[PDB]
Paper text:
Succinyl-CoA reductase (SucD) is an acylating aldehyde reductase that catalyzes the NADPH-dependent reduction of succinyl-CoA to succinic semialdehyde (SSA). In Clostridium kluyverii and other Clostridia species, succinyl-CoA reductase operates in fatty acid fermentation, allowing for the co-assimilation of ethanol and succinate. In these fermentations, succinate is first activated to succinyl-CoA, which is then reduced to SSA by SucD before being further converted into 4-hydroxybutyrate. The reaction mechanism of SucD supposedly follows the canonical reaction mechanism of acylating aldehyde dehydrogenases. In these enzymes, the respective acyl-CoA enters the active site, where the acyl moiety is transferred onto an active site cysteine, leading to a covalent acyl-cysteine intermediate.
Numbering used by the authors:
A (entry chain A), B (entry chain B): 7 to 453
Amino acid sequence: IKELIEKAKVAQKKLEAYSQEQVDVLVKALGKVVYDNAEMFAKEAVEETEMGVYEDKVAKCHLKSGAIWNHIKDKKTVGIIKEEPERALVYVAKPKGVVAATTPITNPVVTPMCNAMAAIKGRNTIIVAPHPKAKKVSAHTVELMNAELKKLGAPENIIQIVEAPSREAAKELMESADVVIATGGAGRVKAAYSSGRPAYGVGPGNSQVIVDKGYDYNKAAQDIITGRKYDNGIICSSEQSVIAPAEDYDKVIAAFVENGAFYVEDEETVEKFRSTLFKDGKINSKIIGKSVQIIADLAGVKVPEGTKVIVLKGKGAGEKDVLCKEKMCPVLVALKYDTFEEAVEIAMANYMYEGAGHTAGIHSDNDENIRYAGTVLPISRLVVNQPATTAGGSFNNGFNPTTTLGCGSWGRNSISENLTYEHLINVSRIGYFNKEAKVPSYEEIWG
Amino acid sequence: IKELIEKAKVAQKKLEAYSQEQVDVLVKALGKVVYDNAEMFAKEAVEETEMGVYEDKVAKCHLKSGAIWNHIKDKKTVGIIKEEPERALVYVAKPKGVVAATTPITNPVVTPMCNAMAAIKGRNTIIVAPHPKAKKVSAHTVELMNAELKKLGAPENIIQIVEAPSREAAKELMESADVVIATGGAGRVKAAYSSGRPAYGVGPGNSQVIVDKGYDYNKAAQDIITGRKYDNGIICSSEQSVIAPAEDYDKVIAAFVENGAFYVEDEETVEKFRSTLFKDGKINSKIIGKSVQIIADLAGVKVPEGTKVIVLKGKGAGEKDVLCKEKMCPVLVALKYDTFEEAVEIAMANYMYEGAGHTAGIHSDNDENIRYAGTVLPISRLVVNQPATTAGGSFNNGFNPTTTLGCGSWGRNSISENLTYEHLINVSRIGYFNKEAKVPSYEEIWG
């Protein structure tokens, strides 16, 4: 670990002499090699991690690589980046140093790519600590990235990976680095914020979805199903619930069935799924990232072939049903509401159960209802009229492309936004003297 | 501690219902009570902490309270605060929760005021843990602030203070709160970033000052002396060195003497001061925040009455002289340089010795030299043509008013900027669907 840190600081000092253009050449090639090898990385990730969908991981590598590069290709991250004469200020971008990045099992390819691109964009180095059950495919990602960096003449060891990620080695890695990124479970995030260094983490996901009255239920069903079933639902922003109005409940369910959902209303059968997804109040690890049919066979319930998601009628909001917790599988819980205010209250109770601070989804044409939900819900991202999995960035919304979605103070994170290059640089200020400025008097200040 | 945390959360939920106007009425009164009681607070702080200057602390309470309120009086921090239709984004400001603030001995009055104003501005509550040698005057500041809050009908216990700050109690306080502010020694800051919660801290100061060739050495001397002597030099941004050109060295020294400096060139006499300021490689606590005459008497060197600062010819740059470390007393170390590039290298070596990430000063008419020093020096603030103590805010510069000056990754802090209301709020995003947006093709992205 001490060797990795020193090799990283030697590389960071050489990388600090790079201009904006030389840094941008490295960052682009990092994302392009993930785009060009999307099919291989996806096949390896599905086999090693034993979760997800091959076709969705290919689209994940194609999307995440292009979306992140297209967003940061023109951003100024080296030296003087911004002038503000109205405040007599000049902004200077400076690297933070060595980045310690712990990557998850759900996104073992794009997360090392995303963190490395954002770190090197600001002239930083990075040491990747992969998830144990995904260390092979994450190392292969780092390998091919370093192969492209070598052909461009980059300083050696700007990206390194821990082949033997011992628990004490990760603790020492986060304490020795200058800034920490923790993308994974809450235990990994809490360790990042206990290392004595500035850290960036994530929180547990549990995307609550409200379908407002009068909205196109067919379009809402297509978006929710696309997000819930994506990569077998292991994305932290994936749809977890369907909070539908009681007066149009059967209409909303009919739209879900029309678009490939299997709806279950009987008390039993629903219990057959509930007892299979959750054992002792915690998610069953054997169904994490598994297909609909695997969950169906384990539950002992016949589910038609071609089904995309399973919708379960919930007993109640919050702790009245364990199905209201996060489900890393293509299963949704359905709940009824009378008023839109009660719909927000339902989503609020599920966030207090689990997932507060992350992402919500809403499908509505009432801008007053959309603004009211975003005002009171403890969330960092409200996704409107689109799949909730676009919270990490799409070419059709304004969220910054990323793989590390910070969840604010609710999720015990430093930021309540998507992780970008900007959180890995120190922005300094040159403050000139504004002799023309006037000092306000007592009346001007306290009047 | 558990009782304090729970009472703070109950108050925070009540304060969360406040509109922008109701919060602003509370924030303004918190600063006004420090302004209106400046003379009393300053007298108590000097007597209890046994450091600083009475008249300088009076001016500190007048400036800090008015400048902080004047900066945040019209800032939107509640609910929807910003529209950005070009990205189809709506920004929502939400509180972080309970703030745990540890306040220093150097600024025992303005720091509880500054942190409380920034926290309540964003509908947060705050628990103050004062420095043991300043707990009485810090508690009196909280008392009078709470007295003004009671008259305005504010919810009870939005500001609390620990009267018995145990070491384990301070640890539990930071771990239990939602966000931590640590303004003090590096030991307090390291504990803040070791609590498992998002933390905001400071780093050790050591403001290096470059006097550029051809500048008005008289004005440069007046500004540097003003900053070095303010509050007997306990401000973390106070001038620490005089990096002067060798070709005009005697001219610069004469300008300092003309404006009240006592310059010492005799190595034996410099050693009498050096052996008094530093004992075993560390600063002598008995001279921290003490006057020139107290330091002179302890050093056994006659210094004329009316002397404002002491200037000592240093043995060399960096570790070649302990006088290049942080000196919390009205004493400056003087160093020569040939080229401006060498002057920056000298300041660089002093920052690697101590103080990297904080503040620098420069007095120059050459904008290229100003921009070069800000581009390479490991600093968060470059103060140009004004006393370096204006780094924490001034009506003639663009630095945000504060008492907590973050030092970035160098000082092991989360931000390289002054602490404001904005670092204590979660900024969420409502992301609408931009159906009219175009998806770039492979050529558009990687071309």
